[PDB]
Design a protein around this ligand. Structure first.
Ligand SMILES: NC(=O)c1ccc[n+]([C@@H]2O[C@H](COP(=O)([O-])OP(=O)(O)OC[C@H]3O[C@@H](n4cnc5c(N)ncnc54)[C@H](OP(=O)(O)O)[C@@H]3O)[C@@H](O)[C@H]2O)c1
Ligand SMILES: O=C(O)Cc1nn(Cc2nc3cc(C(F)(F)F)ccc3s2)c(=O)c2ccccc12
Length: 315
C-alpha cells in the first residue's frame, strides 16, 4: 500500500518530499507541485532554514482545499543546539509557527549529538571542533515525550542513531513512548542491512534519506561515486522502462522503508512520484543490495570526537 503503520497507531506515507538544500525561493513552488501531483508527506527541519517557505506552500494548499490537514504527514526535526530539556519545546514551537501548523505528525531528534546552545547551528571552538552540550539522549527523549503529551506532535522518533543508541532509548528507565521512526542514510552504496533489521525487529519504521546519493551535497567531490550514473542501476531501470531515480526510490520501498527523495525541479518531483506502478524483482533487489560499499554521504569531521558520534559503531 502507500502508507505504513507506525507504533503510535498512525499511518505514514512511504513516499515523501525532502527539503534539504531546497532554496527558500524555490521550495514553496516545489511543495505546491508535490502536493498537486500526490505527495502527502513532507520532510523538513529547522536547520534547513526554509520551513517558513515550506509552510507557505502547505497553508496555500490547505486553504485551496487541495488537501485536508489529516491527509498530510508533516515531519520535522530537533536540531543539535536544542537538546536541553528547557529548549526542546520552544524549538518545536518555532518549527510549528514557521510551518503554519498546530501539530507535527512526526518530530525527530535530528542527530544523537547535542551541541552548545546559541545562534550558531555548529558552534566551534578555536580549533574547529564542535562544542558539545552536556545533555544525554535519554533526557532529550523525555523532553520529546512531553511534546506528545502536550499535543504538539503525534509521534516522536530519532535520526542518525546507531543500534546501541536505539537500544539505549528502548531500554530507557521509565520509557513512555517508543520511537516510531529512525531516519537514516540508505541507498545501494550504504545498504544498512544490520541497522534496518534491528530497528524493524523492534517495530521501529526506518526512513531512508539521501536515496539518490545526495548529488547536490555541498561537499561532494568529482571523484565520488554516483548512484544516478551507475550503469548497472541504469540497466535495471532500463529493464523496467523506468528512470534510475525511479529504481532508486522503489528499492527502499520494497524493503518496507519510507523514502524521501529531494527535488525542486517540477518534472522530477512528478517523475519521483510515479513509483507505484512497477515492481523490482527479488533478484533485482538482492543485486541492488550487492552494491553496498559502506559509503556515507552524510557525516561531518568536526563532530567525530563528540561522545555521542554515531558512526564509530559498526552499525
Ligand atoms: N535526517 C538527516 O540527517 C538527513 C540527512 C540528509 C537528508 N535528509 C532528508 O532526506 C532528503 C533527501 O536527501 P538529500 O537531499 O540528501 O538527497 P537525494 O534526495 O538523495 O538527492 C537530491 C538530489 O537529486 C536530484 N534529483 C532528484 N530527483 C532526481 C531525478 N528524478 N533525476 C535526477 N536527479 C534527481 C536533486 O536535484 P533537483 O533538486 O535540482 O531536482 C538533488 O540534486 C533531504 O532533502 C532531507 O529531507 C535527512
Ligand atoms: O542534517 C541534515 O539533515 C543534513 C545535513 N547534514 N550535514 C552533515 C552532518 N553530519 C553530522 C554529524 C553529526 C554527528 F552526530 F555525527 F556528530 C551531527 C550533525 C551532523 S550534520 C550538515 O552539515 C548539514 C548542514 C546544514 C544542513 C543540513 C546538514
Amino acid at each position: 500500500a502507500s502508507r505504513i503503520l507506525l507504533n503510535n497507531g498512525a499511518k505514514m506515507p512511504i513516499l515523501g518530499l525532502g527539503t534539504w538544500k531546497s532554496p527558500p525561493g524555490q521550495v514553496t513552488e516545489a511543495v505546491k507541485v508535490a502536493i498537486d501531483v500526490g505527495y502527502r508527506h513532507i520532510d523538513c527541519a529547522h536547520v534547513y532554514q526554509n520551513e517558513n517557505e515550506v509552510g507557505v506552500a502547505i497553508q496555500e494548499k490547505l486553504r485551496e482545499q487541495v488537501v485536508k490537514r489529516e491527509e498530510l504527514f508533516i515531519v520535522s526535526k530537533l536540531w543539535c543546539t536544542y537538546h536541553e530539556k528547557g529548549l526542546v519545546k520552544g524549538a518545536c514551537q518555532k518549527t510549528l509557527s514557521d510551518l503554519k501548523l498546530d501539530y507535527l505528525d512526526l518530530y525527530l531528534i535530528h542527530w544523537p549529538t547535542g551541541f552548545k546552545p546559541g545562534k550558531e547551528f555548529f558552534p566551534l571552538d578555536e580549533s574547529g571542533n564542535v562544542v558539545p552540550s552536556d545533555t544525554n539522549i535519554l533526557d532529550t527523549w523525555a523532553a520529546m515525550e512531553e511534546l506528545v503529551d502536550e499535543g504538539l506532535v503525534k509521534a516522536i522518533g530519532i535520526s542518525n542513531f546507531n543500534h546501541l543508541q536505539v537500544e539505549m532509548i528502548l531500554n530507557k528507565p521509565g520509557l513512555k513512548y517508543k520511537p516510531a521512526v529512525n531516519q537514516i542514510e540508505c541507498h545501494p552504496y550504504l545498504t544498512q542491512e544490520k541497522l534496518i533489521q534491528y530497528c524493524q525487529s523492534k517495530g521501529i519504521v526506518v526512513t531512508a534519506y539521501s536515496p539518490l546519493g545526495s548529488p547536490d551535497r555541498p561537499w561532494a567531490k568529482p571523484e565520488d561515486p554516483s548512484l544516478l550514473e551507475d550503469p548497472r542501476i541504469k540497466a535495471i531501470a532500463a529493464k523496467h522502462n523506468k528512470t534510475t531515480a525511479q529504481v532508486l526510490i522503489r528499492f527502499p520501498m520494497q524493503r518496507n522503508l519510507v523514502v524521501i527523495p529531494k527535488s525542486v525541479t517540477p518534472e522530477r518531483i512528478a517523475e519521483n512520484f510515479k513509483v507505484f506502478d512497477f515492481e523490482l524483482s527479488s533478484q533485482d533487489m538482492t543485486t541492488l543490495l550487492s552494491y553496498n560499499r559502506n559509503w556515507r554521504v552524510c557525516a561531518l569531521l568536526s563532530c567525530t570526537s563528540h561522545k555521542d558520534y554515531p558512526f564509530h559503531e559498526e552499525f
